[PDB]
Design a protein around this ligand. Structure first.
Ligand SMILES: O=c1[nH]c2ccccc2n1-c1ccc(O)cc1O
Length: 207
């Protein structure tokens, strides 16, 4: 198990998110589904020039799996996935995002609301989760599990668990007061309101 520090600005962004009373928390699901769609688009385009890219799995979809017993909501996609390097760089640093302008924008006009337009939508997961685990398999690497309960650091380790072929699974370990996101009716309404036009099947697994 390797432990890494988040880039300073990401750590600051996470604390803000972690501690906010921002009301419209449901946007977290929109952001994760939008990230999954992007990942699926990526593997799908690459497969136009090289069909063998789908040897790890031909299905392109997104599944939502609430688990009331474990208090987890899991978002699984079969997109392009992430290499170890991608995990460390993309979830650990500002990378390609507009993080700095977002951090500045506490004086522009928008609050916590425009996160997704600044390329940092992923972190909205911390509005509802005390901890996030990301399990991922990219065609070019082994399967890895990234995890963080914020606080400034994250871990990365080889994942020997159930093989996924290719894709990314985000497991949200929900805060005790955010269990509404495990309710079928709530999940349905959020998908309909924010993600209805996503170009891949989004399937809710009923408990
Ligand atoms: O695993 C991934 N590879 C990607 C490539 C491009 C965009 C998003 C990508 N993702 C990705 C990132 C965050 C998620 O919540 C889900 C994902 O599938």
């Amino acid at each position: 198990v390797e432990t890494f520090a988040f880039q300073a600005e990401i750590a600051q962004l996470m604390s803000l998110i972690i501690n906010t009373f921002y009301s419209n928390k449901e946007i977290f699901l929109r952001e994760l589904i939008s990230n999954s769609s992007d990942a699926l688009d990526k593997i799908r385009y690459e497969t136009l020039t090289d069909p063998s890219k789908l040897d790890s799995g031909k299905e392109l979809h997104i599944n939502l799996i609430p688990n009331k017993q474990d208090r987890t909501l899991t978002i699984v996609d079969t997109g392009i996935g992430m290499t170890k390097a991608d995990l460390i760089n993309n979830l650990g640093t500002i990378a390609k995002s507009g993080t700095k302008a977002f951090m500045e924008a506490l004086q522009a006009g928008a609050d916590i609301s425009m996160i997704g337009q600044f390329g940092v939508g992923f972190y909205s997961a911390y509005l509802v989760a005390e901890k996030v685990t990301v399990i991922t398999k990219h065609n070019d690497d082994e399967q890895y599990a990234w995890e963080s309960s914020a606080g400034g650091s994250f871990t990365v380790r080889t994942d020997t668990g159930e093989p996924m072929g290719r894709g990314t699974k985000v497991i949200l370990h929900l805060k005790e007061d955010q269990t509404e996101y495990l309710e079928e009716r709530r999940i349905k309404e959020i998908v309909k309101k924010h993600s209805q036009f996503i170009g891949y099947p989004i399937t809710l697994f009923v408990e």
